[PDB]
Ligand binder design. Structure first.
Ligand code: HEM
Ligand code: HEM
Ligand SMILES: CNCc1cc(OCc2ccc3ccc(N)nc3c2)ccc1Cl
Ligand SMILES: CNCc1cc(OCc2ccc3ccc(N)nc3c2)ccc1Cl
Ligand SMILES: C[C@H](O)[C@H](O)[C@H]1CNc2nc(N)[nH]c(=O)c2N1
Ligand SMILES: C[C@H](O)[C@H](O)[C@H]1CNc2nc(N)[nH]c(=O)c2N1
Ligand SMILES: [Zn+2]
Lengths: 411, 407
C-alpha cells in the first residue's frame, strides 16, 4: 500500500512506503483522530521478536543481512535472552539505535542532524555520583564553548523495573520556580513542582528568578541524590534587543544547552529509562514558549508596556508585535555571543529538505504536523503547507511518568 | 472510550461522549494519523433519513412522540415511492445550522445557531440562481454589518441534474498569467479566471477585478452573471501608522462566501449551497496577502519598512506579517465592516468548546485548522487538546465542476 503526500505551495507530491514498517499504535481510529492529544517489566515472551526485528534492521543498514555475522548475533541474543531474560547491545548496535530513535522522532524539526550524534556509553555506571560525572562530561562536551554538538549519554537499561536509572530533571539545565504565598510565581512556573522536590531533598535555594536547578539523580533504583552542576560548565546568555536598549534592563537570560533528560530510549525491546540527549535551541522555544506562554515567564505584558503598545484592544495585535521583538532579541543575543541557535525559518526549510531526502532514500519520514509547525508565524514557514504522515517506528524515544509518581522510597 | 481532553494552559479537562455518535470515517487508523492531510440508493437512504429525523425530534423534545413516528413513516413512504424525499422547512433549517455546528475546522461555530437560511429549492434556472445569490449577498453584507447566511438550491437527483456554483467563493478577485511569466491578481484563481474568459467573460485584466458568477442549474451548461458592483462591499487597506501603506494599492472584499461545498442532510445532497459569515483577520492578512502561492506581498512591504532582509534571522518576514495584519483589522474596523481578530475568535471558540462539552457532550475540532496561521501559541486554542471526528449533517468537499460536467 502506497501513500502520497502533497505540498500545497509547491505541488510537490511524495510517496510513503515506510509506514508499512510501522509497529506501535497512534491513538487514532477510523472514527476518531487524536493527532492533537499530547500524551496518547517486559517479558522474554515478547522480547526476542523485538530483538530480531531490530537486529534485522541493523544488519540491513550495514549491508550484512543474512550473513553469518547476522545469524550468529541472532543466535547469541536468542540464547542470552532465555538464559538471562534480557540481552546486551554491542556498541555499534547502541550507537545505531540511538541515532535512529532520533531519526524516528516524528515531532522533531531538527532531524536533518540525526546522523551526527555523539553517543556516550554510560552503561558501566553504577552510582548517582557516577551519573553526575557522566553528565558533567556530557554538558562540557556538548556545550563546547558555545559551538554546540549533539550528544546523548546512555545509562544502564531497565532490568526488572525495580532498579531503574533515572534523571529526575526534565532537562539537565533548567531554572527553578517558586510559588509565593501571594500566588505569584518567582522564576520559572514550569519547574515549581520539581523545585519543591529539590528543596525538600536538601537543596538550599538562592530563590532568584534564574537559579540553575541541581541535578537529581537516581541509580539502580535507589533514592535519588542531589548534585550542583559546576557553574563554569553552565553557559548562559543575557538577553538584549538590537534596537531597544531597555530590553537588557528586563534582566532576562537563558541557558545555551537544551538537554532533555526525562524520556525513555527503546531499542530492540530494551528500555533505557535514563538517556539524557542534547542539541541546540530553535529561537521560538525560548522566545515564544519559554518567555511568552501564559503559564511561563510571561513577559508579553511588560515588553508591550515598554514598547508603548496600544494594549487596550487585542485587535491592535500588540501581543503579536511584542512576541516578534522578543524572538528577535533571543536570536540576536545568541548570535552575538556565538552560541549556536537556529531561527524558525531556517529550521523549517531545513526540515522540508531533510524530509524530501528521507522519502527518496528511506520511503518516508514520519512527522507530527501539530509539533513541527513553529508556535509563531506558522503559515510563512514551508512546513505549514506540507502534508505529513504520522506513525511510529522503533527505535524510539518515548514518554515515561515522572519518577516521583512511581518511585519506591528506601530511606 | 469516554475520552478526555485537557487544556495545558489552564488544566481544564472536558469529557467527550459525543464522538460515540460519529458516523463517517477520519482517514486515520491505529497505524497512521492523517490529521494533516487536506482532503482524505433506496436502501442507503432510509437509514440516513431515520438518523436525521431521530436527532431532529430529539432536539425538539418530541422523541418517540406520535409526530416523530408519523414523520418517520411519511418519509419512509416517500423514499419507497420516489427514491428520494423532501425536507420540511424546519428540518432544512435545523440541518443547515447543524452542518455548521459540526464543521470541525471552523473556528467560528460559536455563532452556529444564528444562521439565516434561504430556501431556494424552487429555483430552476441559472438566472433564478443569480437572483437568489444577489439577494443573499445583500442580506449578508447589510451595509457592512455582516450576517451569516446560506442559500440552498435544489438537492441532487440523479447526478445528471445537479445545481453547482462554479466559483469557490461568490466574491473573489481574478488572476491572469502574465507574458512576463509571473501573475497579476490572485494566483489561486488563474484557472477559474481562464475558464470565465474561456466561457466569454471580458476580463478588465486588473489586479482586483471581481470575478463573474458561473451558475449551473439542473445540470445545464453554466451561465455567466456579473454581481451588481453596488452589492460588493470592498475595503481599502491602510496602516494606522504607515502612510505609505495606502500606495501599495491594496483592498479586499468584506463578504467571505464559500460556494463550492456540498451540504449533506439526512442522506440528501445539496451540491449548491453558498454560505457566508465574516472574516477572521488572518484569513486575508496572513493567508491571502503573504502565502507564496497568493498575493505574496511580504517582500515588498518589508522593503518599505526598510527591514534587514539579508538574513532570515532578523525575523523581518514576521515583523511585516504583523503590520500587514494590523492594517487589515484597522481598515475593516474603520470602515465599520464586521471582522474578528484571531485572539478574539479563538477565545470565543474555547468558550464555545466549553458550552458544547457541557450542553452536547463534545465538539469535534480539527486543531490543524483551528489554530491561526500566525502567533499560534499565544492563542488559547494552541494548548487546547481537541478530538476530530465527523458528525452529520455536514459540509463536504466536492470535485471542481469542470472536471465532471458533461457539456
Ligand atoms: C540539534 C538540533 C535540534 C533542534 C533544533 C531540535 C528541535 C526540536 C524542537 C523545537 C522540538 C519541539 C520542542 C517543543 O517546542 O516542545 C523537538 C522535538 C524533539 N526532539 Fe529535536 N531538536 C534537535 C536535536 C535533537 C536531538 C539531538 C534529539 C535526540 C537525540 C532530539 C529528539 C527529539 C525528540 C524525541 C522530540 C519530541 C519531543 C516530544 O516527543 O515531547 N532532537 N526538536
Ligand atoms: C461568522 C463568522 C465565521 C468565522 C469567523 C469563521 C471562521 C473560519 C475560519 C478561519 C476557517 C478556516 C478557513 C481557512 O483558513 O481557509 C473556517 C472554516 C470553515 N467554516 Fe467557518 N467561519 C464563520 C462562519 C461560518 C459559516 C456561516 C459557515 C457555514 C454555515 C462556516 C463553515 C465553515 C466550514 C465548513 C469550514 C471548513 C471548510 C473545510 O472543511 O475546508 N463558517 N471558518
Ligand atoms: C508532553 N510534553 C512534551 C514536552 C516535550 C519536551 O521536549 C521537547 C524537546 C526535546 C528534544 C529537543 C532537542 C533539541 C531542542 N532544541 N529542543 C528539544 C525539545 C519539552 C516539554 C514538553 Cl511539555
Ligand atoms: C485556504 N483554505 C483551503 C480551503 C478552504 C475552504 O473553505 C474556507 C472557509 C470556509 C468558510 C468560511 C466561513 C467564514 C470565514 N470567515 N471563512 C471561511 C473559510 C474549503 C476548502 C479548502 Cl481546500
Ligand atoms: C498541509 C496542511 O494540511 C494544510 O496546509 C492546511 C494546514 N492548516 C490550514 N488551516 C487553515 N485554517 N486553512 C488552511 O488552508 C490550512 N491548510
Ligand atoms: C494540545 C497540543 O497538542 C499541545 O498544546 C501541543 C501543540 N503543539 C506543540 N508544539 C510544540 N513544538 N511544542 C508543544 O509543546 C506543543 N504543544
Ligand atoms: Zn489522526
Amino acid at each position: 500500500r502506497f501513500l502520497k503526500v502533497k505540498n500545497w505551495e509547491t505541488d510537490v507530491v511524495l510517496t510513503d512506503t515506510l509506514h508499512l514498517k510501522s509497529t506501535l499504535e497512534t491513538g487514532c481510529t477510523e472514527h476518531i483522530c487524536m493527532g492533537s492529544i499530547m500524551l496518547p517489566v517486559r517479558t522474554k515472551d515478547q522480547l526476542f521478536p523485538l530483538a530480531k526485528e531490530f537486529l534485522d534492521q541493523y544488519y540491513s543498514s550495514i549491508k550484512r543481512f543474512g550473513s553469518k555475522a547476522h545469524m550468529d548475533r541472532l543466535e547469541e541474543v536468542n540464547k542470552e535472552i532465555e538464559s538471562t531474560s534480557t540481552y546486551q547491545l554491542k556498541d555499534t548496535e547502541l550507537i545505531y539505535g540511538a541515532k535512529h530513535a532520533w531519526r524516528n522522532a516524528s515531532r522533531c524539526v531538527g532531524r536533518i542532524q540525526w546522523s551526527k550524534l555523539q553517543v556516550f556509553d554510560a552503561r558501566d555506571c553504577t552510582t548517582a555520583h557516577g551519573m553526575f560525572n557522566y553528565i558533567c562530561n556530557h554538558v562540557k562536551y556538548a556545550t563546547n564553548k558555545g559551538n554546540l554538538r549533539s550528544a546523548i549519554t546512555i545509562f544502564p537499561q531497565r532490568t526488572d523495573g525495580k532498579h531503574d536509572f533515572r534523571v529526575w530533571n526534565s532537562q539537565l539545565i533548567r531554572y527553578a520556580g517558586y510559588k509565593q504565598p501571594d500566588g505569584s510565581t518567582l522564576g520559572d512556573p514550569a519547574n515549581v513542582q520539581f523545585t519543591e522536590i529539590c528543596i525538600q531533598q536538601g537543596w538550599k535555594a538562592p530563590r532568584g528568578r534564574f537559579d540553575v536547578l541541581p541535578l537529581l539523580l537516581q541509580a539502580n533504583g535507589n533514592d535519588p541524590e542531589l548534585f550542583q552542576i559546576p557553574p563554569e560548565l553552565v553557559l548562559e546568555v543575557p538577553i538584549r534587543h538590537p534596537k531597544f536598549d531597555w530590553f537588557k534592563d528586563l534582566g532576562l537570560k537563558w541557558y545555551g544547552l537544551p538537554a532533555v533528560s526525562n524520556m525513555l530510549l527503546e531499542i530492540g525491546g530494551l528500555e533505557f529509562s535514563a538517556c539524557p540527549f542534547s542539541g541546540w535551541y530553535m529561537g521560538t522555544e525560548i522566545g515564544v514558549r519559554d518567555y511568552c506562554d501564559n503559564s511561563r515567564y510571561n513577559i508579553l505584558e511588560e515588553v508591550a508596556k515598554k514598547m508603548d503598545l496600544d494594549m487596550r484592544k487585542t485587535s491592535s495585535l500588540w501581543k503579536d508585535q511584542a512576541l516578534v521583538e522578543i524572538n528577535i532579541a533571543v536570536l540576536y543575543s545568541f548570535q552575538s555571543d556565538k552560541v549556536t541557535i537556529v531561527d524558525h525559518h531556517s529550521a523549517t526549510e531545513s526540515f522540508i529538505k531533510h524530509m524530501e531526502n528521507e522519502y527518496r532514500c528511506r520511503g518516508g519520514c514520519p512527522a507530527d504536523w501539530v509539533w513541527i509547525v513553529p508556535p509563531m508565524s506558522g503559515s510563512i514557514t514551508p512546513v505549514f503547507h506540507q502534508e505529513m504522515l504520522n506513525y511510529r517506528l522503533t527505535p524510539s524515544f518515548e514518554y515515561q511518568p515522572d519518577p516521583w509518581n512511581t518511585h519506591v522510597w528506601k530511606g
